[PDB]
Write an enzyme that holds these catalytic residues in place. Structure first.
Site, PDB file in Angstrom:
ATOM      1  N   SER A   1     -43.880   2.038  67.831  1.00  0.00           N
ATOM      2  CA  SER A   1     -44.586   3.307  67.901  1.00  0.00           C
ATOM      3  C   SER A   1     -45.960   3.171  67.260  1.00  0.00           C
ATOM      4  O   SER A   1     -46.152   2.406  66.309  1.00  0.00           O
ATOM      5  CB  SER A   1     -43.788   4.405  67.198  1.00  0.00           C
TER       6      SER A   1
ATOM      7  N   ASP B   1     -24.128   4.500  74.197  1.00  0.00           N
ATOM      8  CA  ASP B   1     -24.751   3.989  72.975  1.00  0.00           C
ATOM      9  C   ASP B   1     -25.694   2.836  73.302  1.00  0.00           C
ATOM     10  O   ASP B   1     -25.249   1.703  73.519  1.00  0.00           O
ATOM     11  CB  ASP B   1     -23.665   3.546  71.997  1.00  0.00           C
TER      12      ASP B   1
END
EC number: 3.4.23.22
Length: 330
Positions: free
Chosen positions: A199, A35
């Site tokens: 992004s 994780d």
């Protein structure tokens, strides 16, 4: 040194991936959920309330000659989905795919929430975010990756997650056979403890690319892709009959539909998520309504590039003094 381990989806929908990890001497092998959105290594154990164990493999520190109680240390964690666990702490030897750390903090669960009890294929979590998020007190502990960094040939790990198939986590080296083209690296912010990056935009299907900054985190521990409501509305508008459902808690679509791909930007590069990766199947057995893999982050406070996005790429987690994230097609 290096390490390499196979990661396998727990079910037919790729809801999560488990990776075998050896703990203690002699080794006890547990299947952990790697994780990058948390920083605790915690396991079901002989100390877990028996009521809350249902088929998991448990760690038994009394059977490990190298286990030592970290006296006075406790931990307590809650995840974004509202699940939670807590307990005490041992140090022990931990090996992943041939890579061994001595003195790793192993957080032994005394209590776990229902979600964890229900999932019998996940014996614990191995956190790979930055150590500032570790919940051990009063003395905060380092992640497996931070403890291994010194010994790694290169201070990196890579995630190569499979679509309905096994994949690979590598530590300390970049497998140049595992991707196509070049790797595009992008800056990481550690300010919140996550692998946080920006992004450069998105496209729906064959539509034109929209240049817009989307701040989010690379999180192998989250199944789906969570993006701003504007982006998610634009995607589902292209699927006939798709709708946001309050009773289900997200966008659903007729199982008979074909889904368009989704592209996200990494600098000047583009990663394409095939439409099939976004299909998470009927909401209940036999239903003709299917659950979508792209959902709104509005109720969360952060955009999350989860497994749906990451499995479409070869992803480099570069833990150099100035950390960066690398994306390549594969």
């Amino acid at each position: 040194s290096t390490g390499s381990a196979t990661t396998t989806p727990i079910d037919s929908l790729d809801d999560a991936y488990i990776t075998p990890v050896q703990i203690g001497t002699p080794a006890q092998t547990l299947n952990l959920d790697f994780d990058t959105g948390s920083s605790d290594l915690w396991v079901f154990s002989s100390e877990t309330t028996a009521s809350e164990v249902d088929g998991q493999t448990i760690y038994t520190p009394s059977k490990s000659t190298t286990a030592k109680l970290l006296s006075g240390a406790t931990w307590s964690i809650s995840y974004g989905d509202g699940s939670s666990s807590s307990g005490d702490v041992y140090t022990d030897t931990v090996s992943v795919g041939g890579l061994t750390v001595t003195g790793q903090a192993v957080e032994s669960a005394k209590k776990v929430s229902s979600s964890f009890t229900e999932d019998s294929t996940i014996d614990g979590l191995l956190g790979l975010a930055f150590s500032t998020l570790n919940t051990v007190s009063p003395t905060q502990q380092k992640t497996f990756f931070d403890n291994a960094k010194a010994s790694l040939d290169s201070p990196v790990f890579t995630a190569d997650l499979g679509y309905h198939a096994p994949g690979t986590y590598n530590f300390g080296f970049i497998d140049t056979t595992a991707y196509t083209g070049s790797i595009t690296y992008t800056a990481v912010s550690t300010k919140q403890g996550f692998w946080e990056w920006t992004s450069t935009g998105y496209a729906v299907g064959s539509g034109t690319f929209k240049s817009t900054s989307i701040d989010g985190i690379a999180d192998t521990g989250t199944t789906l892709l969570y993006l701003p409501a504007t982006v998610v509305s634009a995607y589902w508008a292209q699927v006939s009959g798709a709708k946001s459902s309050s009773s289900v808690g997200g966008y659903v679509f007729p199982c008979s539909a074909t889904l368009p791909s989704f592209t996200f930007g990494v600098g000047s590069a583009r990663i394409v998520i095939p439409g099939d990766y976004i299909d998470f199947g009927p909401i209940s057995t036999g239903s003709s309504s299917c659950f979508g893999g792209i959902q709104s982050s509005a109720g969360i406070g952060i955009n999350i590039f989860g497994d749906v996005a990451l499995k479409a790429a070869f992803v480099v987690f570069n833990g150099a003094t100035t950390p960066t994230l690398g994306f390549a097609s594969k």
